[PDB]
Design a protein around this nucleic acid. Structure first.
Ligand SMILES: Nc1ccn([C@H]2C[C@H](O)[C@@H](COP(=O)(O)OP(=O)(O)OP(=O)(O)O)O2)c(=O)n1
Ligand SMILES: [Ca+2]
Ligand SMILES: [Ca+2]
Ligand SMILES: [Ca+2]
Lengths: 974, 411, 399
DNA sequence: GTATGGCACTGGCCGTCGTTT
DNA sequence: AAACGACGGCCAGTGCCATAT
């Protein structure tokens, strides 16, 4: 068993005969013949490839008959204590609220008859917990309320009970909320709505070594059970196309709406005077009781919704894997050091500096424009001709000798004459003129001279003003810009005649020559509007991403960042010119928007006493440094897919040489003695789709053309999906990747048409339709017998549509059911694209859950001194102690194998190709970056990561290298 | 090639010196040119003042230092460097049979071990002073010594000497922070060069490593022909300091926190003549709408421009105009503004040529006193940036100018 | 002398006890000056420049190179550069050696350069081109402050930083300008002195040129020259430009005239030493003039919380420096000694004012102040101090 | 495959009205 | 009593987020 009937290398004999069954089964010959016919019709049959080296491992013993039972047992073992806690909380009989809340120092517990007693911590297996933070003083918690199945607890910080005008801004564990018990059973569960926010304020969540406490979020459970899509959310808000029966069983993620849906009854009462979001500490000190009552009400609502949701979730996701996956996904962790702060500072500085330069440049342009007044030269400039070039009149009303001594008299006489002249203030009108002689347009940018805010030059000029694009002399495909009233900013085509000021009739044309010779309108674009009647020229709107009839208020918007090639969209001048300003704008675009989120991140710095001994006595530890952590507020299920969501960290952005502040990922640095061991799954979703199609078709790997190309394709030769499509249709690799991912999720032809019209504006629509039709016919194929078949991904789409159309759609691997808001009964053949996207992305979520469970099991069994760090998109990273860096790597590889094997097992396939058996490479590094070799050069970090901070290059190991480094064993005794 | 027109203009307005034939790019780069004209000297003075303000005054542990232009005493033979000898002794040596057969060839060795040399860099004197200056800060290790001076370099009768004025800062640090400090200065200095630049992107930096493995950075300006070095930063460790003071190591110690250690040395050396030339090139022009408004002007920064305002007169009662111009000139100078006394000139050309001349000289503003001024004290003011005239009352002129300059320091 | 040892202790002079001596300081072969000495010299140079150059329409800066290449006059007293590269070629072939090596000395004159003996020649070299700057208006001058090298008698090199003004005048008014400049220079030297009576002038005669004047300062051992004015005339300019004399003509009274040249050269090192001696005449204190003093005010901390007094001192330090006032960051030092020793140290350094911050500054905003010239203690609010300081200096400049 | 609402931010137009003279 | 400069109010477009505080 080394090659399947289709001459595709499979898993090695030693691994196959210990992961799967030795007996097993083999496909019939008819299916093999059908697959051969398919492949040879597509033209791939005769393409043998050199085999890879074989691999043999003594895999750790499994449990049960097969892989499914093994994973079930592992997940159940992981999740048992937390299900025990959840069940204990589900049966709770909550006593009444205390008659009067206490004004105390820390945690206090309230028993029968309202008695209050101070305690160190709740000391409960389960809790429902809510916190309130006053934004007026920063991010330190103010007060919180918790409920156990037996009593009420309340907590408040010293920043409320005691009053003083000085508190350190740098956060420390000494001010956070203590929950964990010292060293009744070790495992603990905390429930809440948006529980990540509450976790961020826990004292013991910032320790380097993980803890057995876990957090279950009500919002994630709601999203899983009865969540809504973005379009569905918009329509739901609009109400509170053809079928509306899904409204009564779904709602937005707000706590009030959730309680209204699951629990019902009297609505929840807010506080109209938002003393936390807009009040002050004095307001809280005055309105203590009411705020505590509101918090208790919110906690009670959260407990009720949890009671009503837990059985529903346990029913719609039976497989134990999902619960453990969420539990492990809810404990993210990002270490950082003092460098983080530096980064922020530096980035901010750079930002400001660039802005100044840009501003300066614009001012220079303004000055250079004034000269155009002479000889009415401005009247020939094809940009500034229409400005207010008016000059006002000024106003009125009401032989050498040698010096002798005592020349001081002459100086005194001159000074007296000057003083005599200084007093001639009676004639001047008191109401002064403002810079007469200067053009009015220039004067608008000049501050009043007498004001205390005066600055020299046109310091008021700035981006977003209609003047700025005119001054830069910007062009679009070499056509100058222009502003009108039937649109925002557009461009001017100079090829017009028949009287469509004389400047535009002859002066503008020359510009096009300088671009045409450097490489009824004949040019095609948005469309002319004769309402604008500039002689001898056509006006064309700048294509707005929302389609025609929309006005573009600025040519420097986000969607215009692609801009054009270096041969256009620029002006000839150099220093303080349009090109440099555009470059500066492109550089600062990212930071301009992300700076608030990035700087607002909450950071807690661990004291020395809290550090593990491995860090204190490490040779690479400095006593003067700072070590802290960020606990991202990612919600385990922020989308109906159950995919995790967070705006800051879970992003596709990475360090770039052209964007300022892009090295944020690189600032997550492991402490001394620790490393970030991780890997990126090789083409996760595409492989999932390929295996789905292959299992649907003939039960053999690679039986479909899509699966073949997925296995036998390589990026290094351009035979992978992205490169092949790019070379067949003629676009960039990234654009082809976007197109392919869009098509995979069920996007139709019109989406492709619009996207490929966006990618290059030159392409006409009547040919964009042809492009989309040809491409989809090649990929998708014809629908039915008359009026999918014949396509490379026909069977994959058939299976996806079939599973989406089922009565109760479920993930083919773990079986989690789709949200009630998308059931065919409720939607009645609506939102089909949403279901098609959901099936694939939820399969990816199941893959992630399987990875997490396997990694946790392997770490626990072999005492690997590590911890899960983060997972972003399809890449995963773990914080592992240095000495075990290699062992963990092997574990990761093992995980991959099992995971893929699992994905093959549930679809009825008893083999796994050797190509996808292991990670292409495993990364070992002390920082987060796409590759361990790049130095992360950015304008804010010009010297590189290695020069400034001292992070060396990492390692990218293979399966064989790890095997030789570890001898293929995870035991410490090796 | 604008390199010709720019240099012709620079010579004409007395930024440079010497005849037209003598001046050339190679001579300017090498440092063997005749020198700089008064405007060039003023520009260099402004640049030096800005550098000193940015580097020395604002810091608690940077002190001035003076290094002699020559180092006497014996040295290592074989350097082939020029030697200093007085012509008064160039005949008494050989008189009356002093080994005059063949030892005169070996007399070269005496030349290698009897006369001093002209210092080639300011680092050596600062290293000499290190020990004595250590008392200024009670041995607090992080501290600097700065100096602006002139250095001499051989260049290729056969070979000549070029003189270059350079600013040097030697910064002694704890070894552990050394690298960090490097980066710090690498930023600061670079930003300084970007501060006054019209095109700060033309100033660039690169990283380099010594054959001994030590780190450093090179700062370049992009002249129309290529990149030219203008400043260097080097991390030197304790090698030079240890050699210069052999024997007891402890005497080099200084305090870092509570640790006595021998400092690491960081040397920053920039060339002020090359910096001035780069700034002159940057301020020059070096497309469609430019075909008409081809004004030739040097847009030097207000903080660097040698002359701020120029004074002239209109035709009328000469004595009164002269008196008021004298008073205004005294007032402007008293407040720290540099004025070009153009009211002393007898001219034979229109205002256009006057404006062109003042633009090539980089005059920020031109003030004109006219007959009507005597009635109400309103003078004409023309700005270099805008070239637009305004009427302004005398009683406030001074203040406004100061304001302008003040803003230029911060904005 | 006690003054010399105090200057050595307070980083005015540079070197060691034996290296520093009267003769070495006067002749210019001293090891160098300390940072305070450099600051004092820079202040003196700035005062000289503003007095001479800033407030005059006919004085311009000039850039003279420290050496003059090309063949020179043979057999004179001045330093010359021995061939540099020639030291590498001779070591592989001998030109018969023996008594033709005397001609080697002549070959030195064929190629050897020369260091700058004085700034007069460099300025004279620029006369023709600098004449255009004033539209040939005959009266104009060139000023420059620069270092010069002198033989000292084995010979030694003495470095002297000197300020030189070359003044071109009509021959008809040369004497009037000469005595005018004499008066102005004498007044400038008297201006900063605590006892101007110790500055004197004399008139001197020469075979060539015309009369001149010498300025002397009375050091404790005798009068010493510090500056000279000479009416050189026209011989040097004519010699430097033989041939068509018309190129040397300036305009005076609508007629062409060959200018007469006067030279005013003053030694700034000697002047700095003279001022140091002057400002030292029952406590050892240097009462340097406020304009010339290198450091104006010194800051310090008092008893109380460190991380608040330190921030107050940092703010005051930044505020004082932003306005051009030099400051001694004494707040960085620990309370190692008593207050009296700190006062004495600042008195020797010539610190104008001493600032003491205390916890009472935090409680009320008051700061203790001590004045160098009076020794009386005062209390002032922080927000005022800056302005007050400027006023003080301003008064000293106007008085 | 359709997209609603609200909040923060900046720029441009406006008709009304006190101030100057 | 006539012209003007200044200004709270209104409109439009952009960016961020459907949640906690
Ligand atoms: N239009 C897209 C493209 C990607 N993704 C997601 C899926 C994965 O989470 C990740 C994949 O991105 P890569 O850049 O890592 O993708 P490949 O692995 O397909 O790219 P390559 O072949 O360039 O390595 O982003 C998405 O949601 N929509
Ligand atoms: Ca909450
Ligand atoms: Ca609440
Ligand atoms: Ca990838």
């Amino acid at each position: 068993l080394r090659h399947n009937p289709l001459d595709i290398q499979m898993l090695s004999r030693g691994l196959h005969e210990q992961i799967f069954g030795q007996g097993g089964e083999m496909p019939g010959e008819a299916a093999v013949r059908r697959s051969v016919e398919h492949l040879q019709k597509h033209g791939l049959w005769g393409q043998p490839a050199v085999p890879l080296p074989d691999v043999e491992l003594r895999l750790p013993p499994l449990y049960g008959d097969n892989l499914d039972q093994h994973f079930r047992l592992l997940a159940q073992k992981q999740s048992l204590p937390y299900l025990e806690a959840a069940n204990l909380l589900l049966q709770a009989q909550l006593p009444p609220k205390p008659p009067a809340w206490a004004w105390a120092e820390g945690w206090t517990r309230y028993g029968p008859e309202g008695e209050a007693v101070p305690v160190a911590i709740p000391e409960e297996r389960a809790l429902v917990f809510d916190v309130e933070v006053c934004l007026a003083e920063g991010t330190c918690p103010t007060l919180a309320v918790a409920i156990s199945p037996s009593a009420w607890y309340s907590w408040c910080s010293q920043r409320l009970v005691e009053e003083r005008y000085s508190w350190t801004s740098q956060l420390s564990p000494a001010d956070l909320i203590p929950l964990e018990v010292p060293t009744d059973w070790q495992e603990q569960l905390v429930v809440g709505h948006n529980v990540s926010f509450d976790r961020a304020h826990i004292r013991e969540q910032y320790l380097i070594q993980g803890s057995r406490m876990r957090f279950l979020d009500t919002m994630s459970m709601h999203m899983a059970i009865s969540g809504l899509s973005s379009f569905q959310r918009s329509l739901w808000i609009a109400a509170k196309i053809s079928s509306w029966d899904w409204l009564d069983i779904s709602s937005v993620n707000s706590l009030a709406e959730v309680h209204r849906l699951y629990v019902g009854g009297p609505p929840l009462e807010k506080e109209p005077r938002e003393l936390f979001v807009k009040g002050t500490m004095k307001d809280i000190r005055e309105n203590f009781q009411d705020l505590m009552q509101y918090c208790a009400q919110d906690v009670w609502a959260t407990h009720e919704v949890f009671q009503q949701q837990l059985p529903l979730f346990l029913e719609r996701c039976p497989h134990p894997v999902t619960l453990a996956g969420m539990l492990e996904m809810g404990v993210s962790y990002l270490p950082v050091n003092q460098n983080w702060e530096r980064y922020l500072a530096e980035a901010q500085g750079t930002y400001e500096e660039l802005q100044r330069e840009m501003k300066k440049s614009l001012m220079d342009l303004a000055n250079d424009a004034c000269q155009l007044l002479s000889g009415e030269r401005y009247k020939e400039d094809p940009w500034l001709w229409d400005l207010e070039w008016d000059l006002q009149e000024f106003k009125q009303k009401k032989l050498g000798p040698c010096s002798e001594e005592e020349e001081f008299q002459q100086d005194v006489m001159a000074r007296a004459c000057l003083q005599k002249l200084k007093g001639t203030t009676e004639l001047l009108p008191k109401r002064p003129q403002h810079l007469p002689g200067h053009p009015g347009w220039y004067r608008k940018l000049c501050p009043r001279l007498d004001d205390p805010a005066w600055t020299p030059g046109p310091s008021l000029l700035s981006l977003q003003m209609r003047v700025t694009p005119k001054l830069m002399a910007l062009t679009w495909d070499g056509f100058p810009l222009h502003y009108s009233e039937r649109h925002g900013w557009g461009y001017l085509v100079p090829g017009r005649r028949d009287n469509l000021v004389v400047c535009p009739y002859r002066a503008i044309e020359s510009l096009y020559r300088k671009h045409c010779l450097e490489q009824p309108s004949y040019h095609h674009g948005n469309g002319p509007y004769n309402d604008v009647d500039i002689p001898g020229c056509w006006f064309f709107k700048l294509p707005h991403k929302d389609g025609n009839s929309c006005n573009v208020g600025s040519p420097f918007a986000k969607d215009f960042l692609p801009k054009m090639e270096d041969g256009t969209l620029q002006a000839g001048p150099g220093g303080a010119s349009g090109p440099r300003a555009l470059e500066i704008n492109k550089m600062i675009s990212f930071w301009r928007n992300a700076h608030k989120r990035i700087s607002s991140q909450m950071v807690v710095w661990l004291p020395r006493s809290a550090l593990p001994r491995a860090v204190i006595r490490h040779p690479d530890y400095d006593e003067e440094g700072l070590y802290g952590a960020i606990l991202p507020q990612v919600v385990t299920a922020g989308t109906i897919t159950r995919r995790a969501v967070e705006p800051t960290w879970l992003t596709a952005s990475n360090a770039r040489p052209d964007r300022v502040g892009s090295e944020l990922k690189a600032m997550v640095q492991a402490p001394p003695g620790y490393t970030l061991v991780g890997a990126d799954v090789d083409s996760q979703e595409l492989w999932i789709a390929a295996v789905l199609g292959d299992a649907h078709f003939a039960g053999m790997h690679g039986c479909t053309a899509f699966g073949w190309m997925t296995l036998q394709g390589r990026k290094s030769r351009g035979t992978d999906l992205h490169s092949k499509t790019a070379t067949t249709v003629g676009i960039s690799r990234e654009h082809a990747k976007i197109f392919n991912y869009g098509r995979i999720y069920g996007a139709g032809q019109p989406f492709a048409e619009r996207l490929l019209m966006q990618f290059n504006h030159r392409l006409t629509q009547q040919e964009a339709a042809e492009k989309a039709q040809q491409m989809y016919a090649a990929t998708k194929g014809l629908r039915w017998y008359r009026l999918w078949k014949g396509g490379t991904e026909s069977e994959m789409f058939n299976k996806l549509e079939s599973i989406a159309t089922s009565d109760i759609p479920r993930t083919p691997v773990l079986g989690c059911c789709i949200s009630r808001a998308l059931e065919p009964s409720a939607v009645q053949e609506e939102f089909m694209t949403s279901r098609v996207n959901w099936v694939v992305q939820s399969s990816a979520v199941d893959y992630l859950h399987l990875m997490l469970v396997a990694m946790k099991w392997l770490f626990e069994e072999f005492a690997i001194d590590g911890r899960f760090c983060i997972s972003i998109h399809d890449e995963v990273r773990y914080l592992v102690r240095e000495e075990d860096r290699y062992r963990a790597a092997l574990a990761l590889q093992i995980t991959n194998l099992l995971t893929r094997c699992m994905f093959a097992y549930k679809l009825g396939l008893n083999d796994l190709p050797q190509s996808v058996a292991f990670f292409s490479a495993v990364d070992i590094d002390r920082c987060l970056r796409k590759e361990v070799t790049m130095d992360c050069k950015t304008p804010s970090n010009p010297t590189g990561m290695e020069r400034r901070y001292g992070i060396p290059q990492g390692e990218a190991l293979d399966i064989y290298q790890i095997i030789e480094l570890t001898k293929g064993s995870l035991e410490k005794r090796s | 090639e604008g390199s010709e027109a720019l240099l012709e203009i620079c010579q004409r307005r007395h930024f440079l010196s010497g005849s037209k034939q003598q001046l050339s790019r190679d001579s300017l780069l090498s440092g063997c040119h005749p020198g700089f004209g008064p405007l060039g000297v003023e520009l260099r003075k402004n640049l030096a003042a800005e550098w000193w303000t940015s580097v020395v005054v604002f810091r608690e542990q940077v002190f001035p230092v003076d290094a002699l232009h020559h180092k006497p005493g014996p040295l290592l033979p074989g350097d082939s460097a020029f030697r200093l000898v007085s012509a008064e002794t160039l005949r008494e040596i050989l008189q009356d049979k002093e080994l005059s057969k063949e030892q005169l060839v070996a007399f070269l060795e005496n030349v290698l071990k009897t006369s001093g040399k002209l210092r080639e860099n300011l680092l050596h004197g600062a290293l000499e002073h290190y020990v004595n200056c250590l008392d200024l800060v009670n041995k607090r290790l992080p501290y600097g010594l700065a100096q602006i001076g002139v250095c001499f370099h051989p260049v290729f009768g056969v070979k000549s000497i070029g003189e270059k004025t350079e600013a040097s800062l030697v910064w002694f640090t704890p070894p552990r922070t050394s690298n960090q400090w490097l980066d710090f200065w690498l930023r600061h200095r670079l930003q300084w060069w970007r501060k006054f630049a019209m095109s700060p992107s033309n100033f660039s930096s690169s990283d380099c490593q010594d054959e001994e493995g030590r780190k450093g950075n090179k700062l370049y300006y992009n002249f129309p022909w290529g990149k030219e070095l203008i400043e260097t930063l080097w991390n030197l460790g304790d090698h030079e300091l240890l050699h210069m003071y052999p024997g007891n190591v402890s005497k080099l110690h200084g305090r870092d926190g509570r640790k006595n250690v021998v400092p690491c040395v960081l040397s920053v050396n920039g060339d002020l003549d090359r910096g001035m030339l780069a700034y002159l090139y940057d301020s020059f022009q070096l497309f469609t709408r430019k075909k008409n408004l081809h004004r030739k002007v040097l847009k030097l920064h207000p903080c660097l421009a040698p002359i701020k305002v120029a004074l002239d007169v209109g035709r009328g009662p000469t004595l009164e105009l002269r008196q008021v111009c004298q008073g205004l000139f005294n007032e402007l100078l008293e407040n720290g503004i540099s004025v070009w006394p153009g009211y002393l000139e007898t001219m034979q050309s229109s205002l256009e040529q006057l404006y062109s001349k003042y633009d090539e000289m980089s005059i920020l503003f031109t003030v004109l006193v006219t007959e009507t001024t005597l009635e109400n004290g309103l003078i004409h003011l023309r700005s270099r940036d805008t070239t637009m005239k305004e009427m302004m009352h005398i009683s406030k002129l001074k203040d406004f100018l100061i304001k302008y300059i003040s803003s230029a320091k911060n904005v």
